[PDB]
Amino acid sequence: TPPPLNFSRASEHRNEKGERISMINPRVVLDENGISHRSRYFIMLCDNETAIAHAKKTSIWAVKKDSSKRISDAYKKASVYFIFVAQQTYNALGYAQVVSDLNSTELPFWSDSSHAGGVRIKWIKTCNLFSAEISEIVSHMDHGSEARDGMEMMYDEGSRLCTLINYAIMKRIGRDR
RNA sequence: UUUAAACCUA
Numbered sequence: 001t002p003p004p005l006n007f008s009r010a011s012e013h014r015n016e017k018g019e020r021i022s023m024i025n026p027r028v029v030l031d032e033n034g035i036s037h038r039s040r041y042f043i044m045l046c047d048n049e050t051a052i053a054h055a056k057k058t059s060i061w062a063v064k065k066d067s068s069k070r071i072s073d074a075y076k077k078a079s080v081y082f083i084f085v086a087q088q089t090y091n092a093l094g095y096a097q098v099v100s101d102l103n104s105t106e107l108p109f110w111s112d113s114s115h116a117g118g119v120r121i122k123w124i125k126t127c128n129l130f131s132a133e134i135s136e137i138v139s140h141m142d143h144g145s146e147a148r149d150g151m152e153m154m155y156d157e158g159s160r161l162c163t164l165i166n167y168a169i170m171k172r173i174g175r176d177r
Numbered sequence: 178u179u180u181a182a183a184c185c186u187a
Contacts, residue, residue, distance in 0.1 A: 027184045124181050162181050
């Protein structure tokens with residue numbers, strides 16, 4: 001059990017060269033946004049149970065136009081993960097790796113004109129999990145304010161969310177299957 | 178009926 005994660009001085013975590021490093025694994029070098037060039041994480045906030053259930057069944061997600069370019073750019077450069085969060089309750093729904101690039105023609109039936117295109121995903125965990133620290137992370141993910149759908153999060157936010165999801169599921173808390 | 182990845186592994 002490592003001590004609580006805090007971003008008040010997260011920018012102060014530096015290696016000997018002066019590069020920003022992760023607070024969770026100091027070997028991971030970050031840019032000045034706290035993002036790892038190798039592993040990148042975006043939040044998908046969603047209240048549509050039809051969409052979420054379709055996504056967990058068919059391993060497809062519709063990407064918003066307002067975040068599609070940054071996600072498409074990240075996919076060509078890094079491993080890219082979506083962490084799915086219920087928009088009103090902040091329950092974690094799971095997380096998945098993006099495994100194909102944006103595609104304007106391959107959109108799920110539930111997508112609308114706010115979406116740019118479809119991506120295939122590979123679910124890593126699925127859940128329906130309430131965790132107070134997950135909810136706190138999502139609540140502060142936009143410079144201390146609530147997450148915006150599709151935004152990229154810092155490496156330590158993504159990694160801690162994956163850890164928290166894995167831990168609960170292993171404790172048989174918050175499973176969906 | 179759910180080994181996160183990566184990094185590091187004497």
